[PDB]
């Protein structure tokens, strides 16, 4: 069921894209240097848009909103004083976010804008170097696409490694091992880094290619077609650090797959590194390093936060409207309270919001503030409980 109808056609947009990261001088996306794809729409809305009205951008097939934290969230589109346009929810089933207009459109006409959208690759697609992707995106029900050169810099040395994603409890870490295949023996690869620990040998699995074509360069390789290591030798250092023990690997290439967890309350850049010794072509010891670092964005990892409360007369008092407003007082969402007086809003992004509730015609509450038969209290999401109690004026 839907709050409005699709508004594609009462959306006039233009669309551009810009190259972020470290590859800005090349004309790519560095995967492995901060690269990231922009996005920049520039929008005009018909005045017969109403509240509730969406309009949709469909991600189309190689990229998706966000770049390497789960989940993946668009963020809602406000106007130059930060009232909120529309409201912004992206379903990944779909690789669609859609935008449903608040009661600005209602407020005010002629309602202009523009907003930015950071942007990845699916790795599992977008899986080689200088690989040139038409990147097809639908905003406003039209198609726009331009090419986009991706490069994650996969190179056939002893040992490099990446980070796929990251969520708030844990990271995806890929090792890969040996990609020049070199005879090595008395191969060890250390594991760690700074936010990050491991506790347990289940999160760190280990395979071995059958040839480099398995070597995807993305960093995220296809492990169902992947032969898994039944018996890797596996140590959990006291540091917090991991240990794995290859052994004797002579030519033999190998794919690290780990899951170390996320630091409690750890603020700043992140690091995972991948420490590679072993014993050369002509009996040397030889060491070899990678490391990947990471921007802990909490509000780009947080999941998702709500609040409610009673409403009742100092006898629960239900069907009373209560809206969710943004603190410059735009409606963002409405409901009522139930037969037990309680109401709710659910899957709100961190931040502050108002409550409004709409008092019965001679009735008054009992910071908070009462204006024309309207209780406005504040709320901040990081659950909450907000209450009203109905006094008769």
Request: charged share 20%; glycine share 8%.
């Given at each position: 069921?839907q709050?409005?109808?699709?508004?594609?056609?009462?959306?006039?947009?233009?669309?551009?894209?810009?190259?972020?990261?470290?590859?800005?001088?090349?004309?790519?996306?560095?995967?492995?240097?901060?690269?990231?794809?922009?996005?920049?729409?520039?929008?005009?809305?018909?005045?017969?848009?109403?509240?509730?009205?969406?309009?949709?951008?469909d991600?189309?097939?190689?990229?998706?909103?966000?770049?390497?934290?789960?989940?993946?969230?668009?963020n809602?589109?406000?106007?130059?004083?930060?009232?909120?346009?529309?409201?912004?929810?992206?379903?990944?089933?779909?690789?669609?976010?859609?935008?449903?207009?608040?009661?600005?459109?209602?407020?005010?006409?002629?309602?202009?804008?523009?907003?930015?959208?950071?942007?990845?690759?699916?790795?599992?697609?977008?899986?080689?170097?200088?690989?040139s992707?038409?990147?097809g995106?639908?905003?406003?029900?039209?198609?726009?696409?331009?090419?986009?050169?991706?490069?994650?810099?996969?190179?056939?040395?002893?040992?490099?490694?990446?980070?796929?994603?990251?969520?708030?409890?844990?990271?995806?870490?890929?090792?890969?091992?040996?990609?020049?295949?070199?005879?090595?023996?008395?191969?060890?690869?250390?594991?760690?880094?700074?936010?990050?620990?491991?506790?347990?040998?289940?999160?760190?699995?280990?395979?071995?290619?059958?040839?480099?074509?398995?070597?995807?360069?993305?960093?995220?390789?296809?492990?169902?077609?992947?032969?898994?290591?039944?018996?890797?030798?596996?140590?959990?250092?006291?540091?917090?650090?991991?240990?794995?023990?290859?052994?004797?690997?002579?030519?033999?290439?190998?794919?690290?797959?780990?899951?170390?967890?996320?630091?409690?309350?750890?603020?700043?850049?992140g690091?995972?590194?991948?420490?590679?010794?072993?014993?050369?072509?002509?009996?040397?010891?030889?060491?070899?390093?990678?490391?990947?670092?990471?921007?802990?964005?909490?509000?780009?990892?947080?999941?998702?936060?709500?609040?409610?409360?009673?409403?009742?007369?100092?006898?629960?008092?239900?069907?009373?409207?209560?809206?969710?407003?943004?603190?410059?007082?735009?409606?963002?969402?409405?409901?009522?309270?139930?037969?037990?007086?309680?109401?709710n809003?659910?899957?709100?992004?961190?931040?502050?919001?108002?409550?409004?509730?709409?008092?019965p015609?001679?009735?008054?509450?009992?910071?908070?503030?009462?204006?024309?038969?309207?209780?406005?209290?504040?709320?901040?999401?990081?659950?909450?409980?907000?209450?009203?109690?109905?006094?008769?004026?």
């Amino acid at each position: 069921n839907q709050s409005g109808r699709n508004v594609n056609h009462l959306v006039f947009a233009n669309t551009s894209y810009e190259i972020l990261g470290g590859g800005k001088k090349y004309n790519q996306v560095f995967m492995t240097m901060d690269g990231k794809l922009k996005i920049k729409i520039d929008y005009t809305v018909d005045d017969s848009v109403v509240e509730g009205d969406y309009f949709t951008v469909d991600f189309g097939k190689y990229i998706h909103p966000g770049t390497s934290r789960k989940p993946y969230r668009v963020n809602n589109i406000h106007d130059a004083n930060g009232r909120t346009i529309a409201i912004g929810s992206y379903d990944s089933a779909t690789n669609t976010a859609k935008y449903t207009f608040t009661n600005y459109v209602d407020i005010y006409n002629n309602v202009r804008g523009s907003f930015s959208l950071l942007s990845w690759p699916f790795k599992e697609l977008v899986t080689t170097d200088k690989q040139s992707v038409p990147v097809g995106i639908t905003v406003a029900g039209e198609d726009y696409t331009q090419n986009v050169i991706f490069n994650y810099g996969n190179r056939t040395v002893p040992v490099i490694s990446d980070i796929n994603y990251l969520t708030k409890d844990f990271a995806e870490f890929t090792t890969y091992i040996n990609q020049n295949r070199a005879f090595n023996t008395g191969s060890k690869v250390r594991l760690s880094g700074q936010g990050f620990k491991f506790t347990s040998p289940d999160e760190i699995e280990v395979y071995k290619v059958l040839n480099n074509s398995q070597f995807r360069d993305s960093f995220s390789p296809d492990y169902a077609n992947l032969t898994q290591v039944r018996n890797p030798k596996i140590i959990i250092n006291s540091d917090g650090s991991a240990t794995v023990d290859l052994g004797d690997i002579g030519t033999l290439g190998y794919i690290i797959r780990s899951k170390p967890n996320t630091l409690p309350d750890f603020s700043g850049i992140g690091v995972l590194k991948s420490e590679y010794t072993f014993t050369n072509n002509k009996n040397q010891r030889d060491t070899r390093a990678h490391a990947s670092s990471i921007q802990f964005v909490r509000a780009e990892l947080a999941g998702f936060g709500g609040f409610g409360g009673y409403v009742w007369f100092d006898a629960a008092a239900a069907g009373i409207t209560v809206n969710l407003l943004d603190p410059t007082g735009i409606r963002l969402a409405t409901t009522t309270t139930d037969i037990t007086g309680h109401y709710n809003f659910d899957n709100l992004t961190n931040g502050n919001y108002l409550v409004e509730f709409v008092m019965p015609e001679g009735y008054i509450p009992t910071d908070v503030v009462f204006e024309n038969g309207r209780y406005i209290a504040h709320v901040t999401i990081k659950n909450m409980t907000i209450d009203a109690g109905l006094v008769s004026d």
